[PDB]
């Protein structure tokens, strides 16, 4: 029972953003940190040990950068905004291409693994696959009846989306109907994630459940009453078959409005660990590259780092703003966290 607070000399607080920083993500091939803000800017921070690029999407009103994603090679940064535009920026901070526009806010966008497509979800109830080479929409899928809140690629051509309409559609480029629709949630679906093998889809909902789905059947395979309140985020550990950690147990993390964080063994359908230190809603969790640690961020203004084998608290950092997102660098020895007061913090865990 010792102290685990990351000391001031191991925390870099980056300032520049003029309002809430909703999102951040590390470059996969170097220690560049991308952040996205309600101030209508994304920023690329250089944390290399060998300095601040500002990517202006217009403080401008209602031009929030809502979403961002690095391609696998780390050469390009895709962003989505409140004004409905998907954009592609170079790692050097130049706007390469404005892809086109959803009608109103983009809520999520993701590169496919191959890096040739970008997938976006909009408040306009649709999803769009964009050609990243030509910078043009390839296909729009108008399947939902309410805002599309999240997307996750199953392959380089197949994906899932979830919605305020409580449904999950599995879609494929070239198909004008969903391949499959998962129904069973009774409230807004906030996130879905394919497992590392692409065989299982996890979903979480305002209906306080976590559901696990399979393409083989209509009903969810698992239906976990995971928390007492709305469940905001889920992540699979990068472990098990088809990962760099093939023998490690596959885990699912979940976190809730009720401030709890939990780790699940999905196969056995049970909760491995409950982490309870947070005191406010948790909006973000993320596994370290080797799956041995879990970061969680809360509006209690703390980042907590958990040992996924024991559930023990191993690191902590109290910042000055409510945390919207936490994320790990490629080496798994730095965590970035974007906060509501305009701060982005880099935590050195060595």
Helical fraction: under 10%
CATH-defined superfamily: YVTN repeat-like/Quinoprotein amine dehydrogenase
Give the oligomer, counting copies of the same chain as homo and different chains as hetero: monomer
The count of DSSP E runs of length 2 or more, i.e. the number of strands, is 32
The third-level CATH topology is: Methylamine Dehydrogenase, Chain H
Q: Provide the CATH architecture.
A: 7 Propeller
SS class: mainly beta
Q: How much strand content do the residues show?
A: over 45%
Distance between the termini: 20 Å
User: Main sheet, how many strands, which sense, barrel?
Assistant: 4 strands, antiparallel
Query: Over the alpha carbons, how many angstroms does the gyration radius reach?
Result: 19 Å
Principal-axis shape equals globular
Count of helical regions? 0
The structural domain count equals 1
- Major sheet strand order: 1-32-31-30
* Broad CATH class: Mainly Beta
Cross-link (Glycyl lysine isopeptide (Lys-Gly) (interchain with G-Cter in SUMO2)): 114
Organism: Homo sapiens
Protein name: F-box-like/WD repeat-containing protein TBL1XR1
GO molecular function: beta-catenin binding; histone binding; transcription cis-regulatory region binding; transcription corepressor activity
